[PDB]
Each structure stands twice: as C-alpha cells, then as structure tokens.
Amino acid sequence: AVDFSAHPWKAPGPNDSRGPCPGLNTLANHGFLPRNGRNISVPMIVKAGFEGYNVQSDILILAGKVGMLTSREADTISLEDLKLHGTIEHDASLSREDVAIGDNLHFNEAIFTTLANSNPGADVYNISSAAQVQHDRLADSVARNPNVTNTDLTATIRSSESAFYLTVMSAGDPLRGEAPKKFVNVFFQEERMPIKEGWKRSTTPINLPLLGPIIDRITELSDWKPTGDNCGAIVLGPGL
Amino acid sequence: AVDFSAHPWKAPGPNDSRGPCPGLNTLANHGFLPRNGRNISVPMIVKAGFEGYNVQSDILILAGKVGMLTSREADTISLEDLKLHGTIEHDASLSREDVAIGDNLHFNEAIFTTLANSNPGADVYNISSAAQVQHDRLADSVARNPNVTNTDLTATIRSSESAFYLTVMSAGDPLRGEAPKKFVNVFFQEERMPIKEGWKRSTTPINLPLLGPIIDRITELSDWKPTGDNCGAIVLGPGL
Ligand code: HEM
Ligand code: HEM
Ligand SMILES: *[C@@H]1O[C@H](CO)[C@@H](O)[C@H](O)[C@H]1NC(C)=O
Ligand SMILES: *[C@@H]1O[C@H](CO)[C@@H](O)[C@H](O)[C@H]1NC(C)=O
Ligand SMILES: *[C@@H]1O[C@H](CO)[C@@H](O)[C@H](O)[C@H]1NC(C)=O
Ligand SMILES: *[C@@H]1O[C@H](CO)[C@@H](O)[C@H](O)[C@H]1NC(C)=O
Ligand SMILES: *[C@@H]1O[C@H](CO)[C@@H](O)[C@H](O)[C@H]1NC(C)=O
Ligand SMILES: CCCCCCCCCCCC
Ligand SMILES: CCCCCCCCCCCC
Ligand SMILES: CCCCCCCCCCCC
Ligand SMILES: [Mg+2]
Ligand SMILES: [Mg+2]
Secondary structure, three states: OOOHHHOOOOOOOOOOOOOOOHHHHHHHHOOOOOOOOOOEOHHHHHHHHHHHHOEOHHHHHHHHHHHHOOOOOOOOEOHHHHHOEOOOEOOOOOOOOOOOOOOOOOOOHHHHHHHHOOOOOOOEEEHHHHHHHHHHHHHHHHHHOOOOOOOHHHHHHHHHHHHHHHHHOOOOOHHHOEEEHHHHHHHHHHOOOOOOOOOOOOOOOEOHHHHHHHHHHHHHHOOOOOOOOOOOOOOOOOOO | OOOHHHOOOOOOOOOOOOOOOHHHHHHHHOOOOOOOOOOEOHHHHHHHHHHHHOEOHHHHHHHHHHHHOOOOOOOOEOHHHHHOEOOOEOOOOOOOOOOOOOOOOOOOHHHHHHHHOOOOOOOEEEHHHHHHHHHHHHHHHHHHOOOOOOOHHHHHHHHHHHHHHHHHOOOOOHHHOEEEHHHHHHHHHHOOOOOOOOOOOOOOOEOHHHHHHHHHHHHHHOOOOOOOOOOOOOOOOOOO
C-alpha cells in the first residue's frame, strides 16, 4: 500500500507553497501531500499524516479543520495560508520568528539554536529538554516582542508541537517521548524524513490518547504561567 | 434557473438530522441540502444557499468552515452537530432556549413570541424591530441564565442572524432590511420557504457588503453592552 521508496524527498521550487509547519512541509516534500503545497483538504492531510507518520485521524481532523479557516476557499488551503497569525500560528515558535518582529513563515537557524543546543550530553531530545526549550523561547518573546501573545491556548498548541517532534521522529516507541537529535534536526532544517539516517515511520499509532500525557508533562515541566490577556480566541478567517 | 417545483417542502422524519439554524433546516426540508440533514460539506452549503436564497459564497464559506468544527468528521457535519454550545450556537437566540436552562436545539414557540410580537402595527419586521427583539432576548438571558455568555462575537453572530431573516425572507429588495411577518413566521415556525404565501428567492445577491451595514445598524439600535470577560473564544471541536 505505502511505498516510501516511491516518495523521494525533493526540494520545493520557488512557487511551491510551504508553511510554518515542518510536519506538513515534510509530507509535501515527499509527495504524501501535493508537492506544490496547494489545494489541500482535511481528508488529504488525514491520509498523508497516516501514511507518512502513523498519525491518526483524531488529531488531524481537529487541527486540520482549524487550519482550513486560514484560507478563503470552501474546503482547501495552501500550506502558506497556515502562517495566518492567531489562528494556529503563534509567537515563541521553535524554528520561526514572531510575526511582529520578523518572519513567522520560514525556518530560521538562529531561532532553532535553542532547540538544537537542548539536552546537552545526550543524543536525544526528550520531555524535559522540550519543556526547557519552550520556557526559553517564551522568555525570548516576552523580552523582545512588544506585541507578544501568550495564552493557555498558545501554550497548549506549543506543547502539542513539541510532542509531535518527539513522537513522529522517534527511533523506538513514540510513547517514550524521546527522539534522536539527528532525526529531529533533519526534520526541522531540511523538512525531510531522515530515511538515509535510519528513521522509520512509527509502527505505533500516534493519536490523542498517546500525545495527551506527553503534552501535559511538557507543559508542567516548562514552568508556564499566565502573563496577560489569556483569552483563547482564534482568528476565524483571513482579512478580519 | 432554479426550479422550486423540483424542491418541494417535506416535513422532516424522526431520524432526519435538524439543527438550531432555520436557514439550513429550511434548505434541507426542500432538498437543497440532503433531506436527512447528514454528510453536509461547505461546498454543499454554498451551492444550497445560492440556489435557495441567493446567499453568496463569502458569508457561507466563512460561517460554514466554523460550523465544520462542531463535528468529528473530516469535512462534513450533520445539521444537529451545529447545536454545539460556544462554537456558533449562543445564548439569547430568537427561537431556541439557552442551553444552561433549556433546549438550545428545537424551535420553541414561547421564546419566539418576542419576535412574533415585534413591530406592532406593521405587517413587516425591520431593522428597528429586530434590534428591539435582540435587546429583549438578551435581557431575558441575563435575568434567567446565570451562565449567560454575551461577547462582541456572540452579539455580531446574533445581528447577522437577524439580518439573514430580514434579507432572505424579503418581499422586495433585501437592501431595504425588512421582511413580511407572514414570510418570516413560516420560516421559523415551519422551516419552510413560504412559496404558497407569495415569497420568491431574492433576485439581488445577499453577500457581506449588503449585510454589513444592516448588521451594524441592528447592533447600534439594540443598546448592547458586553457581559463579563468579553472573551471572543470559540469551542474548537466537540468533547474538549
Ligand atoms: C492538521 C494538521 C496540521 C496543521 C493544520 C498544522 C499547523 C501548524 C501551524 C500553523 C504551525 C505553526 C505554529 C507556530 O509555530 O507558530 C505548526 C507548527 C508545527 N507543526 Fe504542525 N500542523 C499539522 C500537523 C502536523 C504534523 C502531522 C506534525 C508532525 C510532526 C506537525 C509538527 C509541527 C511542529 C513541530 C511545529 C512547530 C514549528 C515551530 O515551532 O517552529 N504538525 N503546525
Ligand atoms: C444560508 C443562510 C443562512 C440563514 C438564512 C441562516 C439563518 C439563521 C437564523 C435566522 C438563525 C437564528 C435562529 C435563532 O436565533 O433562533 C440562525 C442560527 C444559526 N445558524 Fe444559521 N443561517 C444560515 C446559514 C448558516 C450556516 C452556513 C451556518 C453554519 C454552518 C449556520 C449556523 C447557525 C447556527 C449554529 C445557529 C444557532 C445560533 C443560535 O441561535 O444559538 N447558519 N441561522
Ligand atoms: C483540487 O482537487 C480537486 C479534486 O480533489 C479538483 O477537482 C480541483 O479542481 C482542484 N482544485 C484546483 C483549484 O485545482
Ligand atoms: C532527558 O535526558 C536527560 C539526559 O539524558 C536526562 O537527564 C533526563 O532525565 C531526561 N528526561 C526525561 C523526561 O526522560
Ligand atoms: C504592538 O506594540 C506597540 C508598542 O507597545 C504598539 O505601538 C502597537 O500598537 C502594537 N501593535 C499591535 C499589532 O497591536
Ligand atoms: C420599522 O417599522 C416601524 C413601523 O412601521 C417604524 O416606526 C420604524 O421607523 C421602522 N424602522 C425602520 C428602520 O425602517
Ligand atoms: C455556571 O457558572 C458557574 C461559575 O461560578 C459554574 O460554577 C457552574 O458550573 C456553571 N453552570 C453550568 C450550567 O455550567
Ligand atoms: C498544531 C497543534 C494542534 C492544534 C489543535 C487545537 C486543539 C488543541 C491542541 C491539540 C491537542 C490537545
Ligand atoms: C447564521 C449564523 C452564522 C452566521 C454568522 C457566522 C459568522 C462566523 C463568525 C465570524 C465573526 C463574527
Ligand atoms: C464576521 C462576518 C460578519 C461581519 C459583519 C459585521 C461588520 C461589517 C463591517 C465592518 C468593517 C470591518
Ligand atoms: Mg510562530
Ligand atoms: Mg442558541
């Protein structure tokens, strides 16, 4: 059914739509999603995320339908549409700059330094390192971004994203909440599945029951606190 | 051309899905949407709203994709899913009870009394009557529902809904912001297009540019103020 050898990595061209999400960009760069990054529906995302990563429909339907709000189309997006600030896209990203003081769309190596340097002395990233990175990235946004938004919702989304890189890029059981640095680094820096380096699609389904306790533990270890508004309101569509 | 003779009203059966929205219920009762009220996509809503009412894609795409959040499916809903409180469904409805103190799903004649009795001495409802109804419905919820939610967002949705019945059920130019009581009453009470009573689909497109000034004027005349935190956060999916 799914043949990874028939899904080679190819660099996106200059008119291939790419977004702020390394998960979806990586699927597109391997043809699990359309390589042009356009006309993508939630069914397409569900199937691509299952085939590529063994991520289940529960989280992809929930996230996907929120992502659909970022376009002007009835049932599709471009991947670039997802950069719409305050729908899903948030400050204190792991690999992108805050929209008020920089580029909220493209991989940025200087931002990524915090993650790349985390968990000193080990060859994996794990739940405690992930939490430390989140704490540090939010401190960076509070220090440098006069428009910073930090809410219960953005904090949960951020922990979700960390749980994603820990699980989808895992070597063994994604339950363990740890992933080889060499796999995660390739994922973010090149938006490529690190097949050559020894990565394989998880044989364990990654769903909400699995991710939940990981998300909550990342949040707990990150020493997160409310800083201001705390209204979990999302942007419901472009140009409002 | 649209043939309404090909789209007769039929009462919903006991396992036909129906929701809190008279607009979409009415389209289903005429087969513009599936009579069973199930497996409804945003494209289906766009086409049905155009064919039945001359409502354009701008508002239906925006509202439709928010409505999709209420189901567990990738790109469809059942009409009943739309009852999900705090996505679109709100307190101080025109024809339904608040969820905390009653049934937020079915037409309720006692609630509907306020609208049915508005604009005394005219045979139309109009912008000032619609505003008075909204003021009175909200006051009712504030008096009887200690859990009332009333925010910039719910207030905008409410004025949008009033603008819809004023425009879609109009006799002449929907621009005028007035509709025969005999048409509107059938719309709410029977969820039927009042063809027998003389109604015809608008020949003027109903879109955001047309609705916007009507919405804003209803709001202005309604002497509205927020309740509590005024947080415009929506519920992003069922069972959270
Ligand atoms: C419905 C599916 C998905 C949608 C709509 C989606 C959307 C997004 C968006 C909008 C962001 C930017 C958040 C920000 O940093 O400001 C993002 C980030 C991220 N997504 Fe996805 N995503 C989805 C699925 C996935 C999958 C399957 C993975 C797999 C690992 C993933 C991993 C990530 C990671 C690691 C980030 C963090 C990037 C950063 O902080 O620099 N996502 N996602
Ligand atoms: C197509 C034209 C539409 C018309 C004419 C229309 C009309 C209305 C009206 C008049 C109400 C208020 C009922 C009341 O307060 O008792 C209402 C409520 C509602 N409509 Fe629609 N609607 C339309 C489209 C939509 C769409 C596309 C969605 C979502 C996909 C939607 C979802 C709802 C919901 C959830 C409510 C419940 C709000 C509440 O009263 O608590 N409607 N609609
Ligand atoms: C998107 O894909 C659908 C089939 O899934 C196709 O009919 C449609 O034309 C495509 N959209 C565009 C704009 O190319
Ligand atoms: C993460 O790895 C570091 C270094 O190996 C270790 O000290 C720490 O206990 C680990 N944390 C978790 C949650 O496994
Ligand atoms: C961001 O903050 C600055 C300085 O506090 C202020 O001038 C500006 O209005 C803010 N911009 C936004 C996006 O609200
Ligand atoms: C609505 O109708 C009433 C009675 O005919 C009238 O007094 C009122 O001015 C009308 N308002 C608008 C906005 O047309
Ligand atoms: C109403 O709000 C209060 C807030 O103090 C809360 O305790 C209660 O559970 C709410 N009731 C309902 C019906 O949810
Ligand atoms: C990209 C993160 C997923 C966004 C989905 C919003 C709902 C809350 C977070 C998902 C896990 C609880
Ligand atoms: C008939 C009820 C739906 C119409 C209005 C919904 C608009 C969605 C939210 C956008 C900001 C108000
Ligand atoms: C959210 C969809 C309905 C919006 C209509 C209310 C305001 C219209 C004019 C305001 C200018 C931005
Ligand atoms: Mg970001
Ligand atoms: Mg209601």
